[PDB]
Structure 1
Amino acid sequence: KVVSTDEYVSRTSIYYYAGSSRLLAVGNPYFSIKSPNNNKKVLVPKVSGLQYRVFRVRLPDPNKFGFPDTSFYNPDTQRLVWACVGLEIGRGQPLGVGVSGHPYLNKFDDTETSNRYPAQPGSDNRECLSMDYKQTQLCLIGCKPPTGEHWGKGVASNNNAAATDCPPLELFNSIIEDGDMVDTGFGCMDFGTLQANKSDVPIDICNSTCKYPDYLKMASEPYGDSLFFFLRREQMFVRHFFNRAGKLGEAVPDDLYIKGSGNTAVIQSSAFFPTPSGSIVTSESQLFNKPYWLQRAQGHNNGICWGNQLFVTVVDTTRSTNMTLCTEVTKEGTYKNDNFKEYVRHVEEYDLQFVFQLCKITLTAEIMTYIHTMDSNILEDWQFDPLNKYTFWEVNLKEKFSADLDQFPLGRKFLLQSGL
């Protein structure tokens, strides 16, 4: 049924470079700040190293592009499309690690070395704690937005009496949007719905959904439009061991321990949870600021940018430093806490660089039938929308294409790579 694009897409010797120039995002890493009463107007966006960046790269329609000489194809019988053959994800700002926390984290005891009986809980024993998250680098490239997976609240059958009030778990797929949170060491789950107390994870995810890329689904899709290519590097270890306050929903069964007495009469909560740590960041392990040459994709789509668009998805927690800002409210000769206000800001700097190869397609009755079943919108647009409900970082390159490759960094690299 499905065939490689190499069998019906003809490559030309025409190459073009396109660069986004510097892209900047500046905001609060823990939450967005709204303007009242407009609870829907964002004054300060949420900008965090733990966010997916999903760039929707717009390319100029090659069939309406002003080429100096169009004698390389026949518009009566052929249509043009761009193919991505080179990519470099520029990253500015120094390497660094940010931290996240909760002024009311649901941590009760430290359970690593000393947690003797008896335990005297109360009604509110939450603590103001912070941590450094799991480290993640990844880059996804395709002509279709990426698919994520996360656990959310499912539906339980009301037939039989519930042996547990644990919420039912369902694995959801969804498009990863720009700004979505990556998993941080506590799983890819909807914390807003599955953690009702709002205190079991830090505030930058406690009311969010953390998504993980569904690599298995995207790799098995027939046409392979999601993953032309990808890199990923994750790492974490357990930094600390705590337990939760609150009622233990599922009691330890009686065959797993001998009951205590006296000091040990009242069993402590075995609702354990670890804190993650991403450990060290290093230049040597960087995935970015280096060229990717998309020569042969594992899927059937070998870098063909159908619809004259492209999707670059990035996670990079190796520059997650959060800057401390401090203003002086009242100037005095001696230090007073109440004379200053503390703020936290995070920034992200990208510079997307591309090398595109012009391709032509001879529209025979057989190829037209193939492309129609693959995606009818391809032929319609060639003259031979539903993604607007999602949020992407728009990168318009319609006016950025240049045939002079050697005038740009990645272009020079491609010419040396290809022998041109």
Structure 2
Amino acid sequence: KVVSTDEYVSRTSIYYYAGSSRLLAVGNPYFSIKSPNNNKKVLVPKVSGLQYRVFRVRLPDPNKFGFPDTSFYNPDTQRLVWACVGLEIGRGQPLGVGVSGHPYLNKFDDTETSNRYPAQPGSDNRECLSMDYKQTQLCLIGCKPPTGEHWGKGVACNNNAAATDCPPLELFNSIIEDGDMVDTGFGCMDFGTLQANKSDVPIDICNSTCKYPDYLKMASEPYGDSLFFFLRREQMFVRHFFNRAGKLGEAVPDDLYIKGSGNTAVIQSSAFFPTPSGSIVTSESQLFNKPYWLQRAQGHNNGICWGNQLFVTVVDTTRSTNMTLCTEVTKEGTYKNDNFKEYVRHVEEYDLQFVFQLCKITLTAEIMTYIHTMDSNILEDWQFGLTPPPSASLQDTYRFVTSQAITCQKTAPPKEKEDPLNKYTFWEVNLKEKFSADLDQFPLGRKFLLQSGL
């Protein structure tokens, strides 16, 4: 019997703008280049236009404020918590789409115009190719980090039957860490472990786990605090047709086709794959540089930010240019090819605006049960349910510490380690030091105060 989040809180009427600084991101689009001497020191990072840029803001504590007007915040029974009421995510680079390319791709034949019998044999036919990607846009906002699945390996079965050697399949639900790559038109699977020859996708995928946001389980979460609001828009269509090269392990039956001979004694492959390509990208169908007002969220948690932090994730593939730099080592009067070395780089920027509204929460005994069963960590930080620790007096003291009256004393308990999130990499953006209240000196409240009817 989960009740909605608009019965046990009480909306105030005081509003607070916040605003991030301008963020940048420079690095290589393809692979994280390491050190020649070190394997833990990065030199240039792997940032691309195909990643889940996940932001993690950190709101300041509302109870760490000192107001002169102490008539509404009564600290006998009530506490304070922000709410989200708006958002705006801007961009500052031109519209430009980028390409990726594998140097040893398995393009065996061409299967749209002419694949003339017989076969052309040879025990290597891999080569260098490149193509465009499935273009897309989405954004999710919530007080918990988003969930996303991917298809993967597993234990197949027991070992009785011996029908055919085939890999097993199982999808895996996990957390969407930053730096991961979006689905791009080759199925939402691992490519490191489920493929072997690492020569079927381009180089930015061939050691990655292309997850995909579970729109179904995150919709059906029983509390509904992982999705405030979500948008998406994407399109793709095929460009060419090729086919792989290898022994197709599952046989094609002789029933479905008339057997042939002569020049046709050896049957060919039936392992095709298409190539995706995004069409024209306009500035009419963009999804950024526009405000978004949450008048009513879809979940039960109607915008309220527990935990004093939000999770905003956003991904774009329309703004994915690749700056290519070219330098030389010698000055020669004629054109050469051994005289130049060229480099690829990719830039990236973002911007966040917010407008928050703080509302007070009464705390009856009936209410403090209900908050306790959702997550117990939220009641710990307001420091409302505690116990007295026992043990009145100790005797753990000596005047001299390095002596022969000694038991080799040890200390440093690991007590400040409580957040289970440190195994994951987020992009942290600090909002603890940038709140304000005078809206009209800011580029959003003027677009907000006309919406309020004032």
State TM-score, norm by structure 1. Answer: 0.98
Deviates more, 1:67-76 or 1:315-324: 67-76
Q: Which moved more, 1:135-144 or 1:399-408?
A: 399-408
> Per-residue displacement from partner, 1:220-264 (whole Å, max 9, x unpaired)?
001111110010111110111110112212122222211221221
Cα offset for 1:159? 2.7
Provide, for residues 330-354 of structure 1, a one-character-per-residue CA deviation record: whole Å limited to 9, x for no partner.
2211111111112111111100111
Deviation of 1:160 after TM superposition, in Å, equals 3.4
**Residues 121 and 143 of structure 1: CA distance in aligned 2, closer, same or farther (over 3 Å):** farther
Note if contact 1:121-1:245 (Cα within 8 Å) is conserved in structure 2. Answer: no
- 3-state SS of 1:122 partner: coil
Secondary structure (helix, strand or coil) at the match of 2:231 reads strand
2:332 is paired with a residue of what secondary structure?
coil
Q: State the SS of the aligned residue for 1:373.
A: helix
Distance 1:367 1:250, change over 3 A: same
CA distance in 1, matches of 2:67, 2:164: 67
Higher strand share: 1
Give per-residue Cα distances to partners, 1:19-44, cap 9 Å, x unaligned: 11211111111111111332121111
1:64 deviates by 1.1
1:17 CA drift (Å): 1.0
The alpha carbon displacement at 1:162 in A equals 4.2
Unaligned runs of 5+ in 2: 385-418
Whole-angstrom CA distance in 2 between matches of 1:163 and 1:180: 37
Check the 8 A contact 1:11/1:358 in 2, yes or no.
Answer: yes
1:52 offset after TM fit, Å? 0.3
Q: CA RMSD in A?
A: 1.2
Hey, what's the Cα distance between the residues in 1 that align with 2:157 and 2:347? 46
For residues 307-362 of structure 1, what are the alpha-carbon distances to aligned partners after superposition, in whole Å with 9 as ceiling and x for unaligned?
10000000100101111111112221111111111211111110011111101111
Q: Decide whether the 8 Å contact of 1:29 with 1:346 is kept in 2.
A: yes
Q: Secondary structure at the match of 1:388?
A: coil
Deviates more, 1:68-77 or 1:174-183: 68-77
Distance 2:162 2:315 in 1: 40
Q: 1:203 to 1:164 in 2, by over 3 A?
A: farther
> Which whole-Å CA distance do the structure 2 matches of 1:82 and 1:322 have between them?
40
Q: After superposition, what is the alpha-carbon deviation per residue over 1:114-171, rounded to whole angstroms, capped at 9, x for unaligned?
A: 1111112322211100011100100000000000111111220133334333321111
Question: How many equivalent residue pairs?
Answer: 420
Tell me, in whole angstroms, the C-alpha distance in 2 between the residues paired with 1:307 and 1:121.
63
Tell me whether 139-148 or 57-66 shows the greater mean CA deviation. 57-66
Deviates more, 1:295-304 or 1:150-159: 150-159
Query: Are the counterparts in 2 of residues 133 and 276 from structure 1 also a CA contact under 8 Å?
Result: yes
Q: Does 1:359 align with 2:359?
A: yes
Q: Give CA-to-partner distance per residue, 1:69-90, whole Å, 9 cap, x none.
A: 3432211111111111000011
Kindly report structure 1 stretches of 4+ aligned residues shifted beyond 4 Å.
none
Which segment drifts farther, 220-229 or 326-335? 326-335
1:268-327 Cα shifts (integer Å, max 9, x gaps)? 111111110111111111111111111101110111111100000001001011111111
- The verdict on how the C-alpha distance between 1:365 and 1:24 changes in structure 2, with shifts beyond 3 A counting, is same
Contact persistence 1:108–1:242 (CA under 8 A): yes
Q: Distance in 2 between matches of 1:390 and 1:181?
A: 15
More displaced, 151-160 or 221-230?
151-160
Alignment-derived partner of residue 415 in structure 1:
449
Specify the alignment match of 1:43 in structure 2. 43
Q: Distance in 1 between matches of 2:237 and 2:422?
A: 39
> Aligned partners of 1:176, 1:148: CA distance in 2, in Å?
6
After alignment, is 200-209 or 325-334 more displaced? 325-334
Question: Which of 33-42 and 392-401 deviates more?
Answer: 33-42
Q: Which has the larger radius of gyration?
A: 2
What whole-Å deviation, never above 9, does each CA across 1:149-208 have from its counterpart, x for those lacking one? 111112201333343333211111111111110000101111011111110100000110
Equivalent residue runs for 1:163-312 within 5 Å: 163-312=163-312
Which of the pair is proportionally richer in helix?
1
**C-alpha separation in 1, matches of 2:322 and 2:26:** 11
Q: Secondary structure at the match of 1:369?
A: helix
In the alignment, which residue of structure 2 is the partner of 1:392? 426
Equivalent-residue separation in structure 2 for 1:66 and 1:264 (angstroms): 86
Q: CA deviation at 1:68?
A: 4.7
Instruction: Tell whether the 8 Å contact from 1:225 to 1:301 is kept in structure 2 after alignment.
Output: yes
1:406 aligned partner: 440
